[PDB]
Write a protein that binds this ligand. Structure first.
Ligand SMILES: [Fe+3]
Ligand SMILES: [Fe+3]
Ligand SMILES: [Fe+3]
Ligand SMILES: [Fe+3]
Lengths: 307, 307, 307, 307
């Protein structure tokens, strides 16, 4: 079935010390998160660039890593119930906070952790190029050759278009109907590896280190080994849900060329352009498209999705 | 069904500013072109070199990009009816002319835009290496394993042999029969990714910036933001059709080695050489073979072709 | 009287080896050509650049020799009858083919040899700056001061505007009348050294190395010392004549500045601009203006012209 | 059916001028060779190294190209009848000799051209990585999935083990029986792309430039544009057949590691070692194993082989 998604967002200095901490601390946080039985996996991204839309964002390009002074991370964790995410944080607060806080020296902004429900998903399991022979054989043995997925390679061997949208109040249903129609046609593009639509349902105060006064002081004064009071979070997840309603349209691609022209299909193919125009008419903000590299992931989240 | 093809040809300085403008302005032109419902896609090429034919063109080689001071572009746009191309230009002239004119500072020759009909086509849909598992599965589920195409990868990951021919008046039928027979045998060469024969039917004056006196002066005097009179084009598309009749034989290949020895099959394989000799006996000019890289493309034109 | 003109066109690598062969092989070809009594001279050009028309071809300039990776040659041979050119080639094929073929290692495109009739000529004999005293004296002694020409210096000491045009079918007479009126007024421009209008009447297959299948294979397989079958040309000169009709407007100038502002007189001088507008209204293609340096020439062709 | 094989052998200076002539002159010779209807294709190799057999040839390695002062070529041409090869050489002698003689400046040894019959062949058609989807689809449509070959990529994208053997007189039958059993088992090794056994039936004197006294002087005295008398060869092909009987065991591999450990299977796998020991007991000379790169080839010879 469809899990809920927590996306931890932060911006850090673009320097080797940051990427060393990704390799040291990242796996630990993931291991702590996996203590909860509602955890069904994760997909962690670094932003490598921005889709320029021709020259609409003419200072951007799809790979800005060599030039950029910062790196933005977007860490998806998937949950059977979004309340599992909140329980996990509280049950493991002593490990989690101390781990996360060790990133402090590299932080420029964040963490900010909105929660989403998945309202549409066409996402395959990941496979390495070594796996497809056995996948094909199993599917033909089962009499289901239609179930043979594209090869979506894990661990940094594909790219993600992360398309931010916020919708005019009262237009959410028109947006949702038109974006599904759009993605159902978009899957014809070469190198298309899957898509899903995330609809924000709120924000995790504890995952965003957003406390009341007491916890705020505990964070600012912290030597690194004392927890802020997790009961000092002043708001529930739904209380922080944004209006205008926010969505993420998450589309995966074989490479940045397939991304650029594949996403471009909603502008260049007249039939799809007419359908996607109904999306555009609903927007307060967007589409703003970040280019992401899914480097570290627990691919079994897609096994849960498609069961 | 078979679309018509407009091929915009130009020669520009081989320098980074030229390729930057390809990345900034090119997508804009394509987006404007896609406003017309008769537009079914595009395939935009840079010439990377010239087939030397042994040492017949001993100064040429298949990849001259490092040494060449110029870059030739050949931009295919595909149309349900060629008149759609003419209508699109006129309906969107203010955007198109101003976009296109921004390339002027890099231009050495062109634009020149002949219009072609497709008299023969054996062209697959494009697929990325990630896609072939799902394509195979669907074709077997549909009971059509013969319909499984070769893997023709989009966006700069294959090469094109662009073979110019002009034919002795009265020999067009002999040319057309023998070239089809040739291409039906050529598809056995390894790495063959498809072929088509384009027969010129005229030239788009508006796409070639070829006006009467009034438009000529408006082009030469232009600050960049004023349109030449699009009604000042003095000839219709068929009025400029060339005699001797011109053809493009367009053959796609996995790589330049497959191209070199695959096209060479019409000289090296006795059975095919006898067939291709009937092509050669009809020619005023050619074959002259440009090596093209299809870098930017709207691959859905092959979906239209093969429906 | 007016001779016919064959223009051998080719594009070669811009490197010292190419120019060394011009000095070694070029004179030999010309010497073989002078074996025929219908040969009345020659004028051999390298293209040094392209007229930018302001910034219509903003990437071009009048002298591109330092940056360009290729060099284009345009070799005029003049003939009492165009059939003399065809006879000469066949009678001397063993020398000519082997001489021309030794250029192969430098060739990128060509040879392509259209044949032209001269429909208008205002061209003086060449003289060096040392000659003018005797020319002046001789003309006054004869009572013919009007026969004193401008000083048109031979052997690379003037420049040529090579202006390509193709004309809308049915407008040939309007083009020809208007271009003659244009050139009769243009001769007032400072530094004007003469003009002629060449009208294409066909293409020499043998001079273009355009054979049937048999000769094509003999060319491609050639070690350099065996002739392709000269009777294997499959078309006569007039059979290859182009429609739309092609013309060359050939104007000679004291220097590239005189050329730029002198040719510009058809745009800058209102009275001449009105006349030349009648040329522009007839065009399918052009004017496209190559800047040529006449380096090697047999100036006695102008003596034949002016007798 | 099984063609006959001519293998032209030579050793040339290992310098870029040698490889430029391979690209310029090589295709010309092949085009001349394809004039004969008995020609069914070719496979041209450069030796990249020598299999060291541990340190039995401790000064050799599988890739010696960076260090070696020479390059050895082994050019296979395939013929319906070996007499066709002899006929082809004599019928086209003036082109062939002059083309071949242009290699003189680079030659250190050769040419030497033995002729072979194929007594065993397990060789697939070549395919590029782009082709296999259609090959699989076609074979399943034909109901013959067992006929799906390995992917044997043409044009320098695989390697060849060229294993020289000469056999004790009277042991040819034991050798032939044991090598076929060996190769039938060897096809199990990973990356095995095919094998064939060539049995020498003679030597082409004309292809080896081995004339009588008259032709020898004509060769030594040649300016490059005169043929030696091709009828001055003093021996027929079978008159030069070697005793001890010579064989080539030709095995193709995905890469040099597959080659080293795959050919090594006859030493490392006890069951196959016992079978291959019967080959070793018959030998006067060998096995000596050259590592070859098949760079230029006419892949359709395998289409003739497997029909
Ligand atoms: Fe979290
Ligand atoms: Fe166009
Ligand atoms: Fe000529
Ligand atoms: Fe041979």
């Amino acid at each position: 079935p469809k899990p809920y998604v927590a996306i931890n967002m932060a911006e850090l200095k673009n320097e080797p010390k940051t990427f060393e901490m990704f390799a040291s601390v990242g796996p630990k946080v993931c291991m702590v998160t996996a203590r909860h039985p509602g955890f069904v996996g994760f997909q962690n991204h670094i932003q490598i660039g921005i889709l320029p839309f021709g020259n609409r964002y003419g200072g951007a390009k799809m790979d800005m890593t060599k030039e950029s002074s910062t790196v933005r991370v977007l860490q998806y964790t998937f949950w059977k119930d979004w309340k599992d995410h909140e329980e996990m944080h509280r049950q493991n607060w002593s490990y989690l906070f101390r781990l996360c806080y060790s990133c402090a020296s590299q932080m420029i902004w964040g963490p900010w952790e909105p929660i989403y429900e998945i309202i549409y998903a066409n996402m395959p399991i990941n496979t390495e190029m070594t796996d497809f022979t056995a996948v094909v054989g199993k599917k033909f043995a089962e009499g289901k050759p239609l179930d043979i997925p594209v090869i979506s390679q894990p661990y940094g061997k594909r790219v993600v278009a992360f398309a931010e949208h916020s919708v005019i109040p009262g237009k959410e249903k028109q947006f949702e109907d038109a974006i599904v129609r759009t993605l159902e046609m978009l899957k014809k593009a070469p190198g298309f590896l899957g898509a899903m639509v995330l609809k924000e349902i709120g924000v995790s105060g504890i995952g965003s280190m957003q406390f009341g006064a007491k916890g705020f002081h505990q964070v600012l004064e912290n030597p690194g080994s004392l927890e802020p009071d997790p009961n000092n979070v002043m708001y529930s997840v739904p209380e922080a849900k944004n209006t205008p309603q926010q969505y993420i349209v998450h589309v995966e691609w074989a490479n940045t060329d397939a991304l650029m022209f594949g996403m471009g299909r909603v502008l260049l193919y007249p039939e799809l352009r007419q359908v996607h125009d109904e999306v555009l008419d609903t927007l307060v903000y967007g589409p703003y498209i970040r280019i992401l590299n899914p480097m570290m992931e627990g691919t079994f989240w897609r096994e849960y999705l498609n069961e």
